[PDB]
Amino acid sequence: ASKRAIDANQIVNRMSLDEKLGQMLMPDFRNWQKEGESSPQALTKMNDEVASLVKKYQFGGIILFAENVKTTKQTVQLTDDYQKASPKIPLMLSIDQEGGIVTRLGEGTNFPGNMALGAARSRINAYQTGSIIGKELSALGINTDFSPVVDINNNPDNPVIGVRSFSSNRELTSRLGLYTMKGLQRQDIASALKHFPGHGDTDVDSHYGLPLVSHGQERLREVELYPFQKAIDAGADMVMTAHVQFPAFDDTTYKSKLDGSDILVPATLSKKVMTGLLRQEMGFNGVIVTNALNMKAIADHFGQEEAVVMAVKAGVDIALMPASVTSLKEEQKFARVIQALKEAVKNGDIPEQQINNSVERIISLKIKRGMYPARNSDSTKEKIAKAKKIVGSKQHLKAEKKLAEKAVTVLKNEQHTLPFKPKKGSRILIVAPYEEQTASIEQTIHDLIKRKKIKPVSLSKMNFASQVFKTEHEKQVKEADYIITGSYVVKNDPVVNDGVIDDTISDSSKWATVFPRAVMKAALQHNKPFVLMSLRNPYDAANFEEAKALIAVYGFKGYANGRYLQPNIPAGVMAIFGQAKPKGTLPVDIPSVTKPGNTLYPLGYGLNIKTGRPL
Ligand code: NA
């Protein structure tokens, strides 16, 4: 590893301060309003206006969004067109391909998500997930991924990250995060631990619109920072930092450049936090990178040019999205940002050696993940061919399937309700919040029929988001022979009275709690098989203590425009019809609604769908 250290330095010493500064910038070109074009457009394809700016400011990286990677053919092209534009050093192309409810690739393999991998628990599954996203990203020409999220969803009453997080436990989070990370690296992909110093239990400041952490240092070091520490020791490449007001480690305030008020310093802009805590006390010598510096709150309260400078002064190595430049009319923004830096350095506000370090860390990362020198040598056409047989491939899809199905978590199964074994002719009533969800379940039961794994049955759908359970809906439940219902909640806000959920109170506003619970009473009333499939946060499982079949899948996206947007719903359905073997155990604690203060389903709990005994 001492072979990168010198290599990197030999290189930095030969760069103009301007090539060094540009190399610490990583803007986004999500939307671009061309010359003499009516408005801004999703940038699907390169052009001389954007590429000029790359040649000119010589950025160190470009971050990509859903707009930029709509299709596999378009993506592999846009990447190679970027690499052409980049004058001297291979760009570091990055993206938020976490898996689960946060994916970006258009034709790529969306996985069950972190909280799913938590339920699955096996650390090999995590490593496979990263290894595949890695293969996929690598095949497109993307080399950096802002995953793993190692935030900890430890507070039901405040699930800021929820299913994007492995677990409510620090050890399960750090471990799974540890292996997702290593998975990605094995594919030669820069991996960035996400949301330092721990976004999972952030309060908010309604005044400024920033996340605030009010916890003291003992707590912070026990919980929030633990996952990051362990991954940092294990050789994390990058650490992404959120704009979180962080008073236990820095309670420096500034004057808002918009309010005049005394605003706490965001973690990102604090030398005590960036350099003091992360760089020194924690030992992180990788690349530090920040949330979008052009986020409104930040831009408005600290100023754009000023904020990027504060961040670099504070220790970050890569200022992400330093300004919002959509046209060539706005191109002088990048000039100013670099100019602020050039000046703050000339002044000795930022030692030249500090810049040389940062850049030497980027150049070291680029060398370490084979971005530098550029390791490929295939026609863009050939890259595209190779990519189409890799991104979204049947092999990957199978693994996605096995993983989603392994993660399904059975919480109740009284008297073998599951699996459903329908007679020919049986009517299955499918009930979810949105059409794309009832569609996914339907499409899945449909394949099972075409594949002769179940007798032919008849399906109707009921979509209840914002609805109230009225007579119409109840007649439709009598008609049914089998009922599959999806619950969807973030925070669990059942109307309740001394532990007794109140069912006599239904209004449109309470739909995510009152409605599915009304289906359930309706189905019990007429002696129907009813399983409940929770689609997001497992907390809603406390709403269905009377039910006899209950499962969690940790992923709510459905079926649309001919494509499955997530594996979770299908996997649930397969386990309901005895097709898959659900292994899942709770990666979080489900609080009881009927006996407040107690846990209803503890961490690690999960049933063997066949034997009925705790997995
Ligand atoms: Na490429």
UniProtKB/Swiss-Prot annotation:
Lineage top rank: taxon: Bacteria
pH-activity dependence text: Optimum pH is 5.8-6.2.
EC number: 3.2.1.52
Gene3D superfamilies (alphabetical): Glycoside hydrolase family 3 C-terminal domain (3.40.50.1700), Glycoside hydrolase, family 3, N-terminal domain (3.20.20.300)
GO CC list: cytosol; extracellular region; plasma membrane
An annotated Gene Ontology molecular function: beta-N-acetylglucosaminidase activity
Residues noted as binding substrate in the record, renumbered to the chain: 96, 104, 164, 194-195
Keyword flag Cell inner membrane: no
Stimuli inducing this protein: Up-regulated during the late phase of exponential growth and during stationary phase.
Main localization of the protein described in the UniProt heading: membrane
Subcellular location, record wording: Cell membrane; Secreted, Cell wall
Annotated pathway: Cell wall biogenesis; peptidoglycan recycling
Keywords: Cell membrane, Cell shape, Cell wall, Cell wall biogenesis/degradation, Glycosidase, Hydrolase, Lipoprotein, Membrane, Palmitate, Peptidoglycan synthesis, Secreted, Signal
Pfam families given in the database record: Glyco_hydro_3, Glyco_hydro_3_C
GO BP, one annotated term: peptidoglycan turnover
Keyword check for Ion transport: no
UniProt enzyme class: hydrolase
Site (Important for catalytic activity): 205
Membrane topology: Lipid-anchor
PANTHER family listed in its UniProt record: BETA-HEXOSAMINIDASE, BETA-HEXOSAMINIDASE-RELATED
Family per record: Belongs to the glycosyl hydrolase 3 family.
Function noted in UniProt: Plays a role in peptidoglycan recycling by cleaving the terminal beta-1,4-linked N-acetylglucosamine (GlcNAc) from peptide-linked peptidoglycan fragments, giving rise to free GlcNAc, anhydro-N-acetylmuramic acid and anhydro-N-acetylmuramic acid-linked peptides. Cleaves muropeptides, but not peptidoglycan.
Protein's name in the database: Beta-hexosaminidase
